[PDB]
Amino acid sequence: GVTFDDGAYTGIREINFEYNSETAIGGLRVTYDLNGMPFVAEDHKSFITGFKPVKISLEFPSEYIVEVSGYVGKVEGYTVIRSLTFKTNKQTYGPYGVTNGTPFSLPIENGLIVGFKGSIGYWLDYFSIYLSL
Amino acid sequence: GVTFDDGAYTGIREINFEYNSETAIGGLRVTYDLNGMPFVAEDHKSFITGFKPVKISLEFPSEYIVEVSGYVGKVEGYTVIRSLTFKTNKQTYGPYGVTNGTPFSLPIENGLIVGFKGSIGYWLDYFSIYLSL
Amino acid sequence: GVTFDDGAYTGIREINFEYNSETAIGGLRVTYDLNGMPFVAEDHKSFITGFKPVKISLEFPSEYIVEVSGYVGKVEGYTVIRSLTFKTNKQTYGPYGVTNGTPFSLPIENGLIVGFKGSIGYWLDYFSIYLSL
């Protein structure tokens, strides 16, 4: 797929991404906080359409992600992220996508997610998280 | 004067500031690096004019600031930064301004300057530096 | 079990831990690097014996862990870490324990593990990792 790297910022304000109950996670667009002001990063589009967008609007300062989890599996012969769950200190933005395959979880006891990088083709191939205090 | 706070970034690409051989440091404008791309921060202007601008263009990655120093003193009754010297791992951007008063220095053995904050009226009243690996 | 928290150090020199091919991971003792010299942390013992100890001696400076992974499952009704694999930039310290249950993994793209904390009763109940540049 097409690799992307948003780099690092000072926090997260909003996360928008696509998902399909029969396939996997699609495109991804993150709105970071950059020194107190919103910073809309590049939109990382899926090669295809037919997804169900979901917009997670966090109440920046008080609210932040404390855990990211989901499932990895094959779709059309490709290993991709099929599901995602974002747990914050306020609530859980329930499972989105297909929760089948191999589970993965990054619980954060202390620290903050300040960036995302990865790859997207037809679906989210993989991704990495920038962590910081 | 008017306070300012650029926040933190991933490095420094360019530093533009004003100085007067008879008074002190005037305005300041920093061009930071934000995840590989230039980010021109807000221009913090002096209340007045009659300064000599200086543009320190750093050869971002290979070149970075290893020490910031200068002189603090009074001008028209106000304690302000009167002189500044930026030393990098490649060269020294010689003293600019009036090198009289009380000296100060922030040499950096390990780490990077990734942001500036402070206040400016007719002259640079004071400033602080963001440090990070 | 009994909780423990070694805190943070400057690196990892050696990891000693028990495992049983029929149950799960037992006790744990880490020798960290503290500013260029070893620092043997407290031995976190299992309530029982009958384990097989493994001593991973990392060639400190040059060698460091790039991924920790394993399996989580039930033993006598308790959810514990049943298996562990430490991958360094030089080699993989093969699976130790029972590779059955829910997999988990912490791949590290950039950064270093500088400490461990968790809980141990009869077996390793859970554990967390300190990350730092």
Partner: peptide
Amino acid sequence: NGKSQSIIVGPWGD
């Protein structure tokens, strides 16, 4: 070099 470093936790999905 003058590039600020970040902690990044390995990829999931590959």
